[PDB]
Design a protein around this ligand. Structure first.
Ligand SMILES: [Mg+2]
Lengths: 327, 335
């Protein structure tokens, strides 16, 4: 039967690209019905409207477009309210779209609760600023357990913990400590540890060696963006946030792009591929596989959006995929 | 009229490469004397305090890399990082320039990365005052952000480069990186001939992979764990090619851009010497021995044009000694 997914179209290109995914999901005749909520901030005591929370709490699956950043970030409010603690970014090379890196196929799993997010920053005396971050024993264990769980289910064979335990001796030491615990209980997956800089050094040189990477949020999404740089950028990268209660919201990392907002120039590839992720999380694999293949095929051919150097339009690009899916 | 400089063999491929520096130096007739000081892997500080006293005496040092152990107690702070803070070597400079001989995915790269080297991650203070919760406390200051920015622009101006790019995370860390970014702006005013731009570190990593030719000089605070340094090393060929330097008001310490000791390849006569050699060249320029440095540097770059002299790390099949042999060959020609 049809399952229902909370849709949060974003701002700028957000509604436009949301529209495009729905159109393709329709051409794909996939058992999905979109319960649209447009959530904006309300109250400090900031919160998302109850109607949006309950929608997400019920459906468990969210798909969202880019959100303008204005008090507390909406993204922040979402993360906190559904306890999204695992960020997944699978970076795989695109056959139609040539970059200096072609062999790329990685999943970056990052802690999504602490580090930068839990940070407090303040002035100590004039011209001296101090930054405060934290890592907990509980949260490192959780993300590690997720990392191996994701590797096992998604037919992945290696998990690498990325740390900087030379400098963050205590914090990254505790992170490794938990990753080791979990590796002991999950010997199906080959586990190693690397320093962040060596990973970056090697990533640039030969990303083919890496499979699945797990890390804490002391450094943010810098490394995942490094990987996105490898496969053509933020226009084509799916993102997923998995939380407590079986909630999972899939999103696009690329910004709003307001200067282009009208005229449907925008590239809906990233959001679409995120939905493909969503379909697989749901277990609608056939549908995920078809929509994905159509999207890859459409790019390989060239009907390309301007950012991909096509002169084609969002509608056409969407239209072209739609047409392909039907066969 | 010979200089005396401290040499630190260090661990891994360090010592063996240091011997090749000596032999090259003797053959180039360079007026330098190396006063060796060792740093092992015991807890006892005096191993590291002795080197301080030695470097304070000579004011210039060349070193290999010290083995790091992230399984030791938090009381055991990094030897190399103690060395930098104690001697106040605030400016870390790394030149990531493409080598014509070395084949990579990107060409025409010429980046001067200047990084704060006394605060930020070196100031880190961790405590577990409640069981299972580790908190960290970093510091960034106006005084140290100005000097590193003052150094970059001065290096930019004197090197004849056009642009300095500040790399930060001031979108997330309003107060900290915002202060650094503002300290760079204050300096930018006194250097009208230099173009000043800034960029988020997230975006900077992505650009490096796609279009690294856009970067000229880069200045940054000591955060993000040398992501930029290593991405750029990987870009031009790897850790065997890039040299690093640490400048203070008084002292100066020269080394490879990487901290890798190369334990697995040590004593096998296969390590790439060019990183250490170019570092020794930078050391010679600092000692005002500009003729000797140009001779050695040119010899290194020339032998690198030949793929037969390449070592296994960059795909070649030559040995270290064989590489040094061709280096010395080019020096004897121009003499
Ligand atoms: Mg980011």
């Amino acid at each position: 039967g049809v399952q229902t997914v909370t849709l949060i179209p974003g701002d700028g290109i957000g509604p436009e690209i949301s529209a495009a995914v729905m159109k393709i999901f329709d051409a794909a005749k996939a058992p999905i019905q979109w319960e649209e909520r447009n959530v904006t901030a309300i109250q400090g005591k900031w919160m998302i409207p109850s109607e949006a929370k309950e929608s997400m709490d019920k459906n468990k699956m969210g798909l969202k477009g880019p959100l303008k950043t204005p008090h507390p970030s909406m993204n922040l409010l979402l993360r906190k309210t559904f306890d999204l603690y695992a960020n997944v970014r699978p970076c795989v090379s695109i056959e139609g779209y040539k970059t200096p890196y072609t062999d790329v196929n990685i999943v970056t799993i990052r802690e999504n609760t602490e580090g930068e997010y839990s940070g407090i920053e303040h002035v100590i005396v004039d011209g001296v600023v101090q930054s405060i971050k934290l890592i907990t024993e509980g949260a490192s264990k959780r993300i590690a357990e997720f990392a191996f769980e994701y590797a096992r289910n998604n037919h992945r064979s290696n998990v690498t913990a990325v740390h900087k335990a030379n400098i963050m001796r205590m914090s990254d030491g505790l992170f490794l400590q938990k990753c080791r615990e979990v590796a002991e209980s999950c010997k199906d997956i080959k586990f190693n540890e690397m320093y962040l800089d060596t990973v970056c050094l090697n990533m640039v040189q030969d990303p083919s060696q890496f499979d699945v990477l797990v890390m804490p949020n002391l450094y943010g999404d810098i490394l995942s963006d490094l990987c996105a740089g490898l496969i053509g950028g933020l226009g084509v990268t799916p993102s997923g946030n998995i939380g407590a209660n079986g909630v999972a919201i899939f999103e696009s990392v690329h910004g709003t792009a307001p200067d282009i907002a009208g005229k449907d120039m925008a590239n809906p590839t990233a959001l679409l591929l995120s939905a493909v992720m969503m379909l697989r999380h749901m277990g609608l694999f056939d549908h995920a596989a078809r929509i994905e293949a159509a999207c890859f095929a459409t790019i390989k051919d060239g009907s390309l959006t301007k950012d991909l150097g096509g002169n084609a339009k969002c509608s056409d690009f969407t239209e072209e995929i739609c047409r392909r899916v039907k066969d | 009229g010979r200089h005396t400089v401290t040499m630190i063999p260090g661990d891994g491929i360090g010592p063996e490469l240091m011997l090749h520096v000596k032999s090259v130096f003797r053959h180039a007739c360079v007026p330098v004397d190396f006063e060796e000081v060792h740093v092992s892997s015991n807890a006892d500080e005096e191993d590291i305090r002795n080197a301080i006293m030695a470097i304070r005496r000579n004011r210039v040092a060349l070193k290999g890399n010290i083995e790091t152990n992230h399984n030791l107690p938090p009381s055991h702070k990094s030897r190399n990082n103690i060395l930098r803070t104690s001697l106040d070597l605030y400016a870390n400079v790394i030149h990531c320039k493409s080598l014509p001989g070395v084949v990579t995915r990107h060409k025409d790269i010429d980046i001067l990365i200047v990084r704060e080297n006394t605060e930020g991650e070196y100031s880190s203070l961790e405590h577990e005052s409640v069981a299972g919760v580790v908190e960290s406390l970093k510091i960034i200051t106006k005084a140290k952000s100005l000097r590193i920015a003052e150094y970059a622009f001065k290096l930019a101006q004197e090197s004849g480069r056009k642009k300095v790019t500040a790399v930060h995370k001031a979108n997330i860390m309003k107060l900290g990186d915002g202060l650094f970014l503002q300290c760079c702006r204050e300096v930018a005013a006194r250097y009208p001939q230099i173009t000043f731009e800034n960029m988020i570190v997230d975006n900077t990593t992505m650009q490096l992979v796609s279009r690294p030719q856009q970067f000229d000089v880069m200045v940054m605070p000591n955060l993000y764990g040398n992501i930029v340094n290593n991405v750029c090393a990987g870009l031009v060929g790897g850790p065997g090619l890039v040299a690093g330097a640490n400048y203070g008001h008084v002292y100066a310490v020269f080394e490879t851009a990487t901290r890798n000791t190369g334990k697995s390849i040590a004593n096998k006569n296969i390590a790439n010497p060019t990183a250490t050699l170019l570092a020794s060249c930078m050391m010679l320029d600092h000692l005002k021995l500009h003729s000797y440095a140009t001779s050695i540097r040119k010899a290194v770059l020339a032998s690198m044009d030949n793929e037969n002299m390449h070592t296994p790390d960059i795909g070649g099949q030559g040995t270290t000694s064989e590489a040094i042999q061709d280096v010395i060959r080019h020096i004897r020609v121009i003499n």
